[PDB]
Design a protein around this nucleic acid. Structure first.
Ligand code: MG
Ligand code: MG
Ligand code: MG
Ligand code: MG
Ligand code: MG
Ligand code: MG
Ligand code: MG
Ligand code: MG
Ligand code: MG
Ligand code: MG
Ligand code: MG
Ligand code: MG
Lengths: 121, 129
RNA sequence: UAGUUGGUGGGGUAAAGGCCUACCAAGGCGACGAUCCGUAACUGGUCUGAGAGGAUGAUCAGUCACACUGGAACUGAGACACGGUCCAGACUCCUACGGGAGGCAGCAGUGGGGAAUAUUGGACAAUGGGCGAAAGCCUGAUCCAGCCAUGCCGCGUGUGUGAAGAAGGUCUUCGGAUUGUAAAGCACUUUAAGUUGGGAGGAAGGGCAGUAAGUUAAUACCUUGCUGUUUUGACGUUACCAACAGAAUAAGCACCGGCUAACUUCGUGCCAGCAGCCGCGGUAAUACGAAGGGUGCAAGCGUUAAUCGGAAUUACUGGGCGUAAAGCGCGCGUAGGUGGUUCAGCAAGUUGGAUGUGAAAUCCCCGGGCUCAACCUGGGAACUGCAUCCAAAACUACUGAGCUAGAGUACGGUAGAGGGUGGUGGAAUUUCCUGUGUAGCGGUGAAAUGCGUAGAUAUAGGAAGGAACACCAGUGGCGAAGGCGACCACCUGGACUGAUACUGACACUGAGGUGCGAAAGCGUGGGGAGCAAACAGGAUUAGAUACCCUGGUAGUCCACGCCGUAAACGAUGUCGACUAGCCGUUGGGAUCCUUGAGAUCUUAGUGGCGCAGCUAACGCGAUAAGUCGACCGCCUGGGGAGU
RNA sequence: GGGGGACGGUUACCACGGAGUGAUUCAUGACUGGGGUGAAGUCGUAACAAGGUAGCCGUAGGGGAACCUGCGGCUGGAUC
RNA sequence: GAGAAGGUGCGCCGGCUAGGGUGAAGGAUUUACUCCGUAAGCUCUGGCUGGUCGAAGAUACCAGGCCGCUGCGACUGUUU
């Protein structure tokens, strides 16, 4: 474009938005849980992923993901969620911190214990 | 209706050194007749002649040190509609000081090596290698 | 938008003003974005970047705005006043029920919210403020301690010797390899932490006494030099120094399939699980879970959140538009952008210089202090700016005068389906009339529906009516594009070509705005030959709304008005200038020996090949997508959606 | 005694509050219109070769659904 | 639609201040059923400021109830 057009209508830089729309500019967030589904992934895998649905303190009702190897998460129990985009499942955009409030980590684990929250033997 | 005369003198020079011509003849002015004087003293053409009466011409003879010509590129800087003005600090240097750059100063049309010695800025015209 | 925008007269305030009022006048602002909506305290600076820029305004500093909510004035040098006054409201508390009281967005602290943020400290010794200057008195600003790996910078967790290469571990071709001089063993070392002793600097003063100067009428008082004497520290067990103990007091965290430094066994078998992207796992997994080994960093390491880089991915520096996304359907034209050629003037741009400024800090450079560094600090540069003066005059602007190469006019002359209004033809189709004549016609891969002795098709004669315009006809013409083919009259636009005079830059492009817009369709009125969506029947067909067959209405045609889109195509905006060739063709002048089936050259069109050059390639290539200018339109992953 | 002053009275200005009619913005609503995805399933076979009737673009009419037909345009059209 | 809805002003007594219309004392002169044009008067409009009286100022008779959804018939009209 010529110079005499950019004087009349300057170059307006396009903007993005957050891939984590909930927890507005904060790294963690707590919420109480509602339902513990066990859903199935997309096509090229085969598994049965474990998904909980959380109502935060913002009022939002978003699904989440639970890692590890076994969870004690009965309903109406507080958790502490954080971001993280699971490629496999649809609609899942949040992980869940282990060992923080109620989830209490995992057991008999000796590689990468600061992830999943395990102590030192 | 041509809007810029001096970007037409430089266009005929660049084209004639691909048809391997020797003499080029374009209409003249009191600015084009001063630019070709500068290209002669730096040395890119042979000579030039202002030879007519009511449509005065400019006949330029070109050089060939090789099959490749002596001028390899040339571009207009202060195109009409940009009007590039430079002081002595921000005055450019082409190819580490091996090309020439023609700057219209307060003391006449002179090259970049001359006005920087005199300390007079001005308006750039072209960057001939 | 009606104190709204000016004027006048009078008030009002430290001070100019519609600040206020009384009449006068009908103005003012706006596409250079007023008005309105949504959000946000700005700035010196911080964070990235090579740079241009991009985000962002914690601590420190300057300015503004508030002090439970909404008002209002007083006092005063100066407030429309955070610990003042009055009022209204909301909310707590007191009461003898009549009435009262209060405002932590001061320092601590509690409750609440939250992913998340500290002690109800110590003092006036220092620097400062207020009052009194006579010392003193106040100070939750200051100066200091407490808490928290919250960050940057520094130091420890020992050093040397030591191969029977020990056990022990893991792997193995069963030979060994590896953990590994690493341990153990032996010889030394003691910073920090612990313990003991010592120990500055932050202190300037004040009191008291003495003395000398000047004040004076009176060296009485008092002020000032100076001397002498006495007194003062929150920090504080100060930094710092010496001695003693002994190797004792002190290492994790992620990762190891590719990007990417670093690997093999054991469980598991499309399960559990992994993941920043590619993607691994179905019975041998260097990707899941473990075990050895190894690599990165260290008093920290990892994930998440959030900005700038990489992103030439909003391209000013620094990109694109024939087919990848991207050139309006074409014109004319206002605001605006750009300007052929000679002088002359001027100095608004432009360059050079001087002065005033651009707070201090921060960043950068050279130094100086803390055992080093972070940290503190002296001097300089810089802060790209804005303003006032002085000079230069090439280019742009402005002004004055010219010139004819752009552009336009006058004069001959050709070529054309360029428009509009009427008129007139000939061939063919159909309907109708009439004669002759008599059994099928028509249709199709093949048939059937249909039409026929109530005389069809054929064939001859006649009448009426409607629309299209063979051959010429061609990469041929004309038009701004859509478009435009019978012949003649009638009005009427522009282009070509030659000669010659004149005007003397009168030009280009064009957001908004104005027009002309195929076909289908829509409105009122005409008109009804053929063709033919919708439809009807036959056939084909598992099925056939479809293709094919026999029929057949709106429409196609005309007048008037509307709609505005198309593969509206050269998938290529308009305008101007340069760049090897060859073969065609429309129209027009040339030159030329002349008989030419002539010759060559030159403009205005329209075609086929082709060198440089460009292009991702295909391919364009004097009718550019080549080399360059002036203005405009437009593009930013696919769907969602031109919705 | 005058002058002057205060207090009362009264007008102006003004906050709270009350009234009517509008905008605009979120929160939600029986039933409806599409879109994206999925992995089962049914009905077909429209498009890509002359995809078995050459495709597409505009427009109208019709149809379970891809789509079919009409009028005009296009080569991004292949056989000769 | 619509005088939608809905709201304010209104009495007497003065103080000022804009006019409007007739008119004629005179002149123009066409000299007479003529053109222009005053004063004073009567008359009809208004303006902006004071005072004042009452629970009450279009003080009596006189004279719109308004708005939101929906059926049917375009309307004014005519009919036992
Ligand atoms: Mg960069
Ligand atoms: Mg506090
Ligand atoms: Mg001391
Ligand atoms: Mg030790
Ligand atoms: Mg593993
Ligand atoms: Mg960039
Ligand atoms: Mg134009
Ligand atoms: Mg500074
Ligand atoms: Mg076309
Ligand atoms: Mg197009
Ligand atoms: Mg009725
Ligand atoms: Mg009756």
């Amino acid at each position: 474009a010529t110079i005499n057009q950019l004087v009349r209508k300057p170059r307006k830089r396009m903007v993005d938005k957050s891939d984590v729309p909930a927890l507005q500019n904060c790294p963690q967030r707590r919420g109480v849980c509602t339902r513990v589904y066990t859903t199935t992934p997309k096509k090229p895998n085969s598994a049965l992923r474990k998904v909980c649905r959380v109502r935060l303190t913002n009022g939002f009702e978003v699904s989440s993901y639970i890692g590890g190897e076994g969870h004690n998460l009965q309903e109406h129990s507080v958790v502490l969620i954080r971001g993280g985009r699971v490629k496999d499942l649809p609609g899942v955009r949040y992980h869940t911190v282990r060992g923080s409030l109620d989830t209490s980590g995992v057991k008999d684990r000796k590689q990468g214990r600061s992830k999943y929250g395990a102590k030192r033997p | 209706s041509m809007q810029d005369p001096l970007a037409d003198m430089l266009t005929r020079i660049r084209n004639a050194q691909m048809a391997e011509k020797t003499v080029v003849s374009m209409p003249s002015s009191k600015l084009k007749a001063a630019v070709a004087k500068v290209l002669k003293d730096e040395g890119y053409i042979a000579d030039f002649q202002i030879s007519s009466e009511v449509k005065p011409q400019l006949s330029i003879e070109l050089k060939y040190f090789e099959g490749k010509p002596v001028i390899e590129e040339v571009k207009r800087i202060s195109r009409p509609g940009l009007r590039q003005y430079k002081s002595v600090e921000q005055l450019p240097k082409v190819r580490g000081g091996l090309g020439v750059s023609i700057v219209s100063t307060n003391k006449g049309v002179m090259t970049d090596r001359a006005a920087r010695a005199a300390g007079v800025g001005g308006e750039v015209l072209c960057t001939v290698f």
